[PDB]
Write a protein that binds this ligand. Structure first.
Ligand code: CA
Ligand code: CA
Ligand code: CA
Ligand code: CA
Lengths: 359, 355
């Protein structure tokens, strides 16, 4: 007996504790002239597609260090609006010289970053903050710095001076920082159909939806590049009846996850908690999820993480389904051998010859 | 009051007179492990006392299933106690465990009668504590006589009701435990004078140091009892769904009492927000023992016991990175399974039988 969030949630509270009732079609959640936003680069023909020149970016990687980006927008979706920044202007020139597409590393709801500001500390902030949030730092080889009025960034540059293979002090402190930072790639799905809240100015409520859309409009209109969303349907961040991040396995136990044939343990071939795109309702979840990112978020293409773990039939089914919302949608992924051929014809480089799905 | 654990830990039973007071050793007098010159207790006889003690530690329940002295799965009511069903209760709250009370010999006096000539003052102090741990760390209600924390003696008086201030003396200035202060009442203990003389001088009388050592041990045990809701489950059904024992069966090591308490997902709700499970280990043996049962389990000694240090009952307890526990002689350890970021699987019970 437990209260669980919706797997079909489209809006959430801070740290995805509660699902929110939302209407993605609301003008209030749209940047000005969202309804008339078009794809800057064509994707209709094979010749149109072949022109595709992808730049795989990450929200923090883009604006975390750029000083020309207003402080409050660093490591945010809204950073792409800082028209007069080194990063924005750089992308602007790359776009002008031929980079056609922007690929976004996990921007769906990741589990691996605390969305509560006060339970997190980044290198930009004083070392004291690190100790307040991180219990471990108070009892480590760096405990002495909690007293210093210097930032984590500062302390890190200091450690470089004597960093060597025999004294790897820079990485030792970083390991601890990394537990309470805002930095993760995000290949840890909590909710598939909601944007990540930590990349938003305020993660409580709908704010993230307007902000994300605002970033899409900036990328397509102001930077003139299409958008590819990196997707992770191969696994869930957790399963079981206790994990905070188990959503799917708390609602329909033993259904959504791929289990070992003997033990019923959730397999971890992908890392983490192997999902089951071979099961009908999870295949439906995936398709319905992609529909939302397709029409409500105006995404031009999708890159499937460890796509080999998906059945070729599912990828093709989802593709035909999504094509009815956007006929020029592109699907590609990592089609390596997953070792699931005993279970179904895998969506692999070999198996996808002539399907249209890229690898 | 439950006489089952009482008699198993203390040794013998009431009405014992003469050499039987020495011959009938207990788990805490070293029955089997460290026998005295008069002892003739068999291995099965000693194993049966372990069976009764375990049942008692799990709140002496009639329906609690355990692995007996022979390896059979038996309900608590199926374990004999002098012709009676050992286990009888529905909930541990219906049972009062004890190893000392106003009536009959004090715990110390019983150890003095029952301990091997080899057991020095230091081991006998720990013998008292070990005896008390079975009560203090068990699911049933903990009861004890005033003075047990000060190695209380009545200089072998059995029925001290009218033995006045002299025999019933409790020194709160901690100079002595009132041991060897005279021969007890002839009328009721005369028949035991020959046994008293044989044992009386076997070991030195406790002093300020020993009483302080025992008080420290007593305070340790009670602190532990209040350190987790897992020690005091209250409901019989909770006991059965969470409590189990290791070092059970025909092949069992004598004097080793190992109790496991689940807070894992299979038990139900997370009762302790800090723990996933508990281990109570009582090594009532003169040889140090080893625990490979918790193979690769990430355990830690109680903070209560770690704070105690050299004065801990766990002093010398080793927990190898590989989950192996080394338990020193006459020692008690509370090994705890820390909870991660969520209730994991802990120490699930065998679930060998129900009802
Ligand atoms: Ca999140
Ligand atoms: Ca992180
Ligand atoms: Ca398999
Ligand atoms: Ca717990």
């Amino acid at each position: 007996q437990y209260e669980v969030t919706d797997p079909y949630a489209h809006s959430l509270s801070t740290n995805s504790e509660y699902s929110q009732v939302v209407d993605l079609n609301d003008s209030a959640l749209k940047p000005d002239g969202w309804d008339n936003l078009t794809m800057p680069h064509a994707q209709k023909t094979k010749a149109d597609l072949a022109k595709m020149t992808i730049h795989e970016s990450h929200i923090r990687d883009l604006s975390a260090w750029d000083q020309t980006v207003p402080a409050e927008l660093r490591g945010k979706y809204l950073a792409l609006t800082a028209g007069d920044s080194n990063m924005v202007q750089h992308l602007k020139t790359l776009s002008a010289s031929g980079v056609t597409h922007v690929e976004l590393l996990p921007v769906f709801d990741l589990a691996t970053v605390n969305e509560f500001s006060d339970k997190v500390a980044d290198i930009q902030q004083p070392f004291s903050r690190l100790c307040e949030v991180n219990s471990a730092v108070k009892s480590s080889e760096f405990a002495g710095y909690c007293d210093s009025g210097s930032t984590v960034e500062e302390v890190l540059n200091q450690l470089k001076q004597s960093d060597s293979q025999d004294n790897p002090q820079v990485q030792a402190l970083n390991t601890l920082v990394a537990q309470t930072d805002s930095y993760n790639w995000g290949y840890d799905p909590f909710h598939y159909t909601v944007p990540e809240g930590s990349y938003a100015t305020d993660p409580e409520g709908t704010t993230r939806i307007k902000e994300f859309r605002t970033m899409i409009q900036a990328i397509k209109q102001d930077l003139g590049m299409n958008v590819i969303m990196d997707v992770v349907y191969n696994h869930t961040n957790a399963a079981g009846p206790t994990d905070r991040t188990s959503v799917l396995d708390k609602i329909v136990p033993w259904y959504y996850q791929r289990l070992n044939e003997t033990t019923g343990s959730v397999e971890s071939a992908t890392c983490c908690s192997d999902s089951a795109p071979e099961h009908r309702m999870f295949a439906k979840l995936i398709a319905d999820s992609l529909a939302v990112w397709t029409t409500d978020y105006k995404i031009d293409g999708f890159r499937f993480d460890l796509m080999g773990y998906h059945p070729k039939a599912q990828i093709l089914s989802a593709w035909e389904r999504i094509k009815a919302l956007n006929p020029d949608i592109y699907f590609f992924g990592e089609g390596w051998d997953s070792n699931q051929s005993d279970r179904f014809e895998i969506a692999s480089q070999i198996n996808l010859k002539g399907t249209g799905i890229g690898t | 009051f439950s006489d089952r654990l009482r008699d198993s830990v203390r040794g013998g039973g009431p009405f014992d007179s003469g050499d039987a007071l020495r011959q009938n050793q207990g788990i805490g007098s070293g029955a089997g492990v460290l026998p005295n010159e008069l002892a003739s207790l068999s291995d099965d006889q000693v194993r049966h006392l372990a069976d009764l003690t375990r049942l008692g530690m799990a709140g002496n329940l009639a329906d609690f299933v355990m692995i007996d002295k022979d390896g059979a799965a038996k309900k608590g009511s199926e374990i004999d106690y002098n012709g009676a069903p050992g286990g009888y209760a529905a909930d541990p709250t219906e049972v009062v465990n004890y190893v000392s009370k106003h009536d009959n010999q004090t715990l110390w006096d019983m150890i003095s009668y029952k301990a091997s000539q080899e057991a020095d003052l230091a081991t006998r102090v720990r013998m008292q504590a070990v005896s008390l741990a079975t009560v203090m760390l068990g699911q049933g209600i903990a009861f004890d006589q005033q003075g047990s924390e000060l190695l209380r003696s009545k200089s072998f008086t059995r029925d001290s009701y009218d033995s006045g201030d002299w025999f019933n003396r409790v020194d709160y200035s901690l100079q002595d435990n009132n041991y060897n202060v005279g021969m007890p009442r002839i009328s009721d203990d005369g028949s035991n004078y020959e046994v008293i003389t044989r044992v009386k001088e076997m070991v030195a009388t406790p002093g300020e140091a020993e009483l302080k050592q025992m008080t420290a041990f007593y305070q340790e045990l009670t602190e532990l009892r209040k350190s987790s809701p897992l020690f005091t489950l209250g409901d019989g059904s909770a006991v059965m769904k969470r409590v189990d024992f290791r070092n059970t069966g025909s092949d069992q090591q004598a004097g080793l009492l190992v109790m496991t308490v689940d807070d894992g997902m299979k038990a139900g709700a997370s009762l302790d927000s800090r723990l996933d499970g508990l281990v109570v280990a009582i090594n009532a043996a003169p040889e140090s023992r080893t625990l490979n049962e918790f193979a690769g389990e990430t355990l830690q000694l109680s903070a209560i016991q770690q704070t105690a240090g050299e004065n801990s009952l766990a002093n010398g307890v080793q927990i190898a990175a590989d989950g192996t526990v080394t338990l020193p002689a006459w020692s008690v350890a509370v090994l705890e399974l820390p909870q991660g970021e969520a209730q994991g699987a802990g120490l699930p019970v065998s679930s060998y039988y129900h009802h």
